């Protein structure tokens, strides 16, 4: 105990509570900027997916490896993770979901390969011992596509070279400003579309120079966009998860102030009485 030692700890917890309030404010602004950047990315993927759907599932459906379900013997995951802490359980929730789905796959005896976005995933998977084969880290507030190009390229090359037979992205979906969910989604072979372009019966493109090489480029760019979107959604999920976590930490500090102040009051009362009793009893 000791009245001064307790008051020092009360001050140190108040200082912690103030720091956590500032971190909550900063995260609550970064979340808005990130979730607007998230909306700036939709048109590219939407209009490209309508084109791919016209070339691939419409009239004169061209054949491509990415379109069709060749038999599976090993699987590839692109995993997005943060470079930062204090985000709550977000990355461990995602990595435990991955390790469960990857273990179900390895029950069937298939092998699995990982490519990492962000330093947290690298650290965790190397501690677990996962087979990471490519990585990019230090994206910060500023995720570029021209840095995603690398690991996406490795996983696309491994697919067309015939090694990987299925490709996934593993990411948190931002749904509400206080609700995010870890998800695994299939990138390749291309997901089935719900819509039918039979109403595009009435027209066809003038394909310059030739449709097959153009469909190859379209599919490569689309996989890239879908990965970039998964990175930006995970980044906005990171800002919202940090906001909520710093809110909770500020309330925990505020409760701990009450409990420390009660202990301080008792200590200072006991000190007053033990002194005044020594003085009065000393005077014969």
């Amino acid at each position: 105990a000791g009245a001064k030692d307790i008051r020092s700890k009360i001050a140190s917890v108040q200082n912690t509570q103030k720091i956590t309030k500032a971190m909550e404010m900063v995260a609550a602004s970064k979340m808005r900027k990130s979730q607007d950047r998230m909306a700036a990315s939709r048109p590219y993927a939407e209009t490209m997916r309508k084109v791919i759907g016209h070339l691939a599932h419409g009239n004169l459906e061209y054949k491509h490896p990415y379109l069709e379900d060749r038999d599976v013997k090993r699987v590839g995951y692109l995993v997005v993770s943060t470079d930062r802490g204090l985000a709550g359980g977000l990355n461990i929730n995602l990595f435990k979901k991955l390790l469960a789905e990857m273990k179900t796959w390895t029950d069937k005896g298939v092998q699995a390969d990982l490519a990492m976005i962000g330093s947290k995933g690298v650290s965790f998977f190397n501690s677990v011992g996962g087979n990471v084969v490519a990585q990019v880290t230090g994206m910060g507030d500023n995720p570029s596509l021209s840095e995603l190009i690398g690991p996406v390229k490795v996983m696309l090359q491994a697919y067309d070279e015939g090694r990987l037979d299925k490709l996934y992205i593993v990411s948190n979906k931002f749904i509400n400003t206080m609700s995010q969910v870890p998800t695994i989604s299939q990138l390749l072979p291309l997901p089935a579309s719900d819509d039918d372009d039979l109403k595009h019966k009435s027209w066809d493109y003038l394909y310059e120079p030739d449709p097959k090489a153009l469909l190859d480029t379209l599919l490569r760019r689309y996989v890239e966009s879908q990965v970039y979107q998964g990175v930006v959604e995970n980044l906005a999920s990171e800002q919202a998860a940090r906001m909520v976590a710093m809110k909770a930490a500020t309330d925990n500090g505020g409760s701990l102030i009450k409990e420390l102040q009660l202990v301080y009051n008792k200590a200072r009362q006991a000190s007053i009485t033990q002194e005044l009793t020594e003085i009065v009893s000393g005077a014969a």
Partner: peptide
């Protein structure tokens, strides 16, 4: 200005 130290690039 106490808040500011933790928040660069502010409104």
């Amino acid at each position: 200005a106490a808040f500011s130290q933790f928040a660069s690039d502010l409104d």
